[PDB]
């Protein structure tokens, strides 16, 4: 059964590597829409699904242990076609894009830390990568956004300490970019790796939402950080704020958009008929 959660203002990331002072910039890119319904998976008994991608993924998680320990991206999650694997050791992340023969229920296996329960073939990978942190920099929310454009990925990440709440708190925090990988891979399906300690696990929970092409109005303060954003298709007042390019709308009528009824069907009448030039005499002579 599903279980949803309202994501209020989440998944706003820095669109480009450009410093901007106190400036309201109106951008148009793949953003997770405001006040949306993200899906609150548990996978704990053990049941983690293979979800679609469709346009990026916003992935939040609230886990003080180390269980959500990487991801699997691909198109068939099998051999014959390539797939991407992000595993997350205690010291370094190893991204690997090979023709993995992925198992049915993939998991890591810790005591020793093995890998042979995830896949069973590693033929012909053309990309390897090693960076240090990638994860763990009261409880702490960790948010990621994956999106694959043209041929190269993009992972945005932000780890923030939060108090006890709905695990997607009412606030704002911009996501800063982490890596930028030239993979050249069609990606449409993904799922999450876990660790099982050798069977028995703790209590996982992750929040998955999907990015859509939206127009945002981001507000950069003096130090170049994003403090607020307005989604230009969430109602009328947000459309007014995106028309004015401001966040404060004083009193009065403000013309924003245009209303133009569309069509519908498409009749096409003509004239009855007349002479019918008989093929009756040429196709049917005695």
């Amino acid at each position, epitope marked *: *059964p*599903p279980a949803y959660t309202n994501s209020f203002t989440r998944g706003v990331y820095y669109p480009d590597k450009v410093f901007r002072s106190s400036v309201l910039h109106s951008t148009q890119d793949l953003f997770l829409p405001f006040f949306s319904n993200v*899906t609150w998976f548990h996978a704990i008994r053990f049941d983690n*699904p*293979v*979800l*679609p*991608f*469709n*346009d990026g993924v916003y992935f939040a998680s609230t886990e003080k242990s180390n269980i959500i320990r990487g991801w699997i991206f691909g*198109t*068939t999650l*099998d051999s*014959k*076609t390539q797939s991407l694997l992000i595993v997350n050791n205690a010291t370094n992340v190893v991204i690997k894009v090979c023709e993995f023969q992925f198992c*049915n229920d993939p998991f890591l296996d810790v005591y020793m830390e093995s890998e042979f329960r995830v896949y069973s073939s590693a033929n012909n990978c053309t990309f390897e990568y090693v960076s240090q942190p990638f994860l763990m920099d009261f409880k702490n929310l960790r948010e990621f956004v994956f999106k694959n454009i043209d041929g190269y990925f993009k992972i945005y990440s932000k780890h923030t300490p939060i108090n006890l709440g709905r695990d997607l708190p009412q606030g704002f925090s911009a996501l800063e970019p982490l890596v930028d990988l030239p993979i050249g891979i069609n990606i*449409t*399906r993904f799922q999450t790796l876990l660790a099982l300690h050798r069977w028995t696990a703790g209590a996982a929970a992750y929040y998955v939402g*999907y990015l*859509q*092409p939206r127009t945002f109005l981001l507000k950069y303060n003096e130090n170049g950080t994003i403090t607020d954003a307005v989604d230009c298709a969430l109602d009328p007042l947000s459309e007014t704020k995106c028309t004015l390019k401001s966040f404060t709308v004083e009193k009065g009528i403000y013309q924003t958009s245009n209303f133009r009824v569309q069509p519908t*069907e498409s009749i096409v009448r003509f004239p009855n008929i007349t002479n019918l030039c008989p093929f009756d005499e040429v196709f049917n002579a005695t």
Partner: antibody
Amino acid sequence: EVQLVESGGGVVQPGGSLRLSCAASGFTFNSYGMHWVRQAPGKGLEWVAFIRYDGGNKYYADSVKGRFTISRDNSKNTLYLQMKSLRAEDTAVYYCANLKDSRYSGSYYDYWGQGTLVTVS
Amino acid sequence: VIWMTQSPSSLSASVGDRVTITCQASQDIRFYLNWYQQKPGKAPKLLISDASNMETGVPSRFSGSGSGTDFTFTISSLQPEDIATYYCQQYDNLPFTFGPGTKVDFK
């Protein structure tokens, strides 16, 4: 535990109009691009339409491109097929399908509907 | 439009026998082809995805092979619940096209 219940089938005069509705409840919906598939009585399965996860791109079959429109309402989790200018070659059983694609929709589970008998007489 | 043909469109074989069903395309579909089974009176249940990856909840009698233009559905033994109609599907070019479907029967 998945439920795809469909409605809107009945006797239609030729050249009429219908709104086939597919109420989806179970999986998450709106993360999957969903399909309309039809089967003529005594014939094989045909294909009608496909819509993406956000209602962005819609694709139709090469025989019914223009007489049908496909839409989705993610607030109530429904699929809709507006059928206008029906001929007698459209009397069928329409299924509301979620095909185990893996190239376009990127789904992984195969969830079929039940099928409505649209008789155009 | 990617036309598909299926052979043989009529088939009758007893228990324990083997059934081969060839799906032939008009264009090139690399390994993107689904094999469905529809028992008469119900919605079709999928059996094989991407022409070789058998699913979960299906017995290991069925197998799929082939690539390019020719694909093959193979039933190693006919149990009495194998009597249905089997369909293809392609995935590369929209629209997706099903096959005409082959009917398996008992002798």
